[PDB]
Amino acid sequence: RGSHMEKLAKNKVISIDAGRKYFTLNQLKRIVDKASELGYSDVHLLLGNDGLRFLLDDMTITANGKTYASDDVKKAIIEGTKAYYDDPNGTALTQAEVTELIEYAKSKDIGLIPAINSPGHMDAMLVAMEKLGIKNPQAHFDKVSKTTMDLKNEEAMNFVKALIGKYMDFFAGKTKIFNFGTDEYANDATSAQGWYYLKWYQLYGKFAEYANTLAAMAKERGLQPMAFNDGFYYEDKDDVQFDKDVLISYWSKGWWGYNLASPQYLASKGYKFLNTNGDWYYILGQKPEDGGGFLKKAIENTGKTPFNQLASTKYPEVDLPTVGSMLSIWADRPSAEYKEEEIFELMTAFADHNKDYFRANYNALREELAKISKESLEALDAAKTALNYNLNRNKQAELDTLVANLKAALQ
Numbered sequence: 369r370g371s372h373m374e375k376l377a378k379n380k381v382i383s384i385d386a387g388r389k390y391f392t393l394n395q396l397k398r399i400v401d402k403a404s405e406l407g408y409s410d411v412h413l414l415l416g417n418d419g420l421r422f423l424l425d426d427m428t429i430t431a432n433g434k435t436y437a438s439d440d441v442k443k444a445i446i447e448g449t450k451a452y453y454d455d456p457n458g459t460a461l462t463q464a465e466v467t468e469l470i471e472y473a474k475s476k477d478i479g480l481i482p483a484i485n486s487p488g489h490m491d492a493m494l495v496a497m498e499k500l501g502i503k504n505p506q507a508h509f510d511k512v513s514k515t516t517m518d519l520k521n522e523e524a525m526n527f528v529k530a531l532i533g534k535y536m537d538f539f540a541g542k543t544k545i546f547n548f549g550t551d552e553y554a555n556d557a558t559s560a561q562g563w564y565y566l567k568w569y570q571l572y573g574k575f576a577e578y579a580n581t582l583a584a585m586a587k588e589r590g591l592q593p594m595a596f597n598d599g600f601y602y603e604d605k606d607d608v609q610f611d612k613d614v615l616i617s618y619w620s621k622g623w624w625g626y627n628l629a630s631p632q633y634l635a636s637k638g639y640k641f642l643n644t645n646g647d648w649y650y651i652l653g654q655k656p657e658d659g660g661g662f663l664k665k666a667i668e669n670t671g672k673t674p675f676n677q678l679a680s681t682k683y684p685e686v687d688l689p690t691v692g693s694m695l696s697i698w699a700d701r702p703s704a705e706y707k708e709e710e711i712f713e714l715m716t717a718f719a720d721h722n723k724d725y726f727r728a729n730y731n732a733l734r735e736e737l738a739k740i741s742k743e744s745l746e747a748l749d750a751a752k753t754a755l756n757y758n759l760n761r762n763k764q765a766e767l768d769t770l771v772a773n774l775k776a777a778l779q
């Protein structure tokens with residue numbers, strides 16, 4: 369049970385699935401603002417998750433000894449993403465929009481953590497590849513996957529690695545972490561038994577090297593690699609080795625015949641966790657009747673599930689090292705309406721149940737600071753000096769008073 373300092377140093381992350389579904393820059397700014405207000409440290413933004421919803425200004429890709437022109441890559445990606453879900457609200461964020469988003473979050477002490485999913489959840493990239501002349505990028509098992517790249521297809525792999533590298537190059541120097549996903553390999557084509565299928569066809573070693581290369585690409589570009597736990601040391605076996613520097617976003621140990629590594633086992637291999645507990649999931653539009661991650665359950669679970677409790681473990685009987693925790697908003701059915709206040713209420717309850725971990729609200733202090741002769745310059749200083757930047761969410765009134773004193777002095 370940490371000191372105030374340890375508690376505040378942990379990441380508090382709100383995750384938004386803008387891979388499946390379009391979110392405007394304004395919508396994401398409002399999320400950033402609300403995250404800042406409630407005391408979160410980061411917004412985790414999925415840009416590639418099924419749909420690919422982010423184009424750089426220059427999308428020229430070099431791979432397979434060949435060159436794929438920027439205009440063609442954009443067109444193919446737009447077609448890929450539209451084939452997955454032609455969202456009426458928009459298709460993809462631009463490079464200027466994400467740059468502005470990052471610079472807005474930074475002004476509020478909020479990090480951005482981008483996620484570009486592969487080799488699963490990459491519907492949009494698969495079709496984009498077909499459009500660029502890359503035949504059969506899809507995994508084939510019980511049927512031809514719509515979500516997952518064939519690991520035997522070197523043409524497709526090289527392209528995707530080049531694509532992901534250009535994304536990484538953009539986020540280099542702008543964000544600390546890059547999440548490359550790897551959750552649910554070929555779920556759609558194996559009845560959600562993808563890992564078993566990879567092991568069956570002796571392609572799991574091939575998955576690992578793919579995962580290890582993305583990890584290496586991230587580190588080389590000065591980005592801390594992150595990935596979902598699913599495909600790491602599946603079934604607690606270690607004949608296939610994984611990069612030990614990946615931050616594991618741990619969400620679940622899986623279900624009958626989806627026998628993921630335990631958090632105990634990954635901690636024994638040296639891993640650090642971002643606690644992305646499935647208990648906190650909310651899928652837009654999910655009703656109580658539907659079961660699963662509906663709003664009332666997620667809200668209840670921010671109460672029942674301790675901040676540090678990794679899925680499948682009881683806290684504190686099992687106490688594993690985490691850098692923080694992440695509450696996740698998903699868009700499984702992307703035509704469900706995004707209701708801002710649902711997300712806000714859920715964000716609020718997670719903060720309200722963990723006040724020791726969340727910062728106080730510094731938006732009014734910032735607003736006041738940017739408003740700035742005699743012994744009245746002496747006063748403005750003594751108020752400036754009395755500012756405390758270390759206050760948690762339990763101490764908002766204390767902060768309000770310090771801000772009130774500084775307002776007084778500036779008048």
Ligand SMILES: CC(=O)N[C@H]1/C(=N/OC(=O)Nc2ccccc2)O[C@H](CO)[C@@H](O)[C@@H]1O
Nearest residue numbers: 551552560596619623626649651698699700
């Ligand atoms: C890492 C993660 O949360 N992956 C998927 C996800 N996986 O949740 C599962 O429980 N998936 C699952 C179901 C059956 C067998 C194996 C995995 O949940 C979110 C909400 O449904 C989806 O948006 C995600 O894409």
